[PDB]
């Protein structure tokens, strides 16, 4: 089944992680190219576009876009996508909750590429959904790996790490961080793929090597 992704950039490319994680799967993207009315309408518009292109399911593949306004908005936007489209729909924030929960992570450390105000909305989203945010640190693989280690060492009681940057190239850092700390890392972009592949069904597995998430069915 084709998996449709609504992507933040105007260019509307399938995010680069897809070619590494799921080379055998058909993905298509529609680029969205601030302001809840404008977000709701473009998102519904672009979901219909992917439906028209033959998507079997649709993921809103931006974490900030989907958690900035809280957990209730994420939930309601998903339903509006589904009602416009007739397809199972999801978001990168839901993908993150699903991955954290699959991995038994309740107390979560934050490693992100966001400003303060956005990191605050992230931790608020997670606590709304009854996870426990602990440490937060925010900004290549070397810098990403160090980011998460500094996130974890700032809060050693964490069950795992949320690496939140759906725009960044993160797949090399995840295994290296899990290898070094022994704790799982859920990252936005890979998690959004993992979640969208699950949603679509069929049961395909990711290429080996990209972290503990991908051993979760």
Curated annotation (Swiss-Prot):
InterPro entries according to UniProt: Iso_Racemase_Enz_sf, MaiA/AMDase, RibuloseP-bd_barrel
UniProt entry tagged with the keyword Lyase: yes
Recorded superkingdom: Bacteria
Keywords assigned: Decarboxylase, Lyase
Reactions listed under catalytic activity: 2-aryl-2-methylmalonate + H(+) = 2-arylpropionate + CO2
SUPFAM superfamilies: Ribulose-phoshate binding barrel
MF annotations from Gene Ontology: arylmalonate decarboxylase activity
Keyword Transport: no
EC number, as in UniProt: 4.1.1.76
PANTHER family: BLR3294 PROTEIN (PTHR40267:SF1)
The protein's name: Arylmalonate decarboxylase
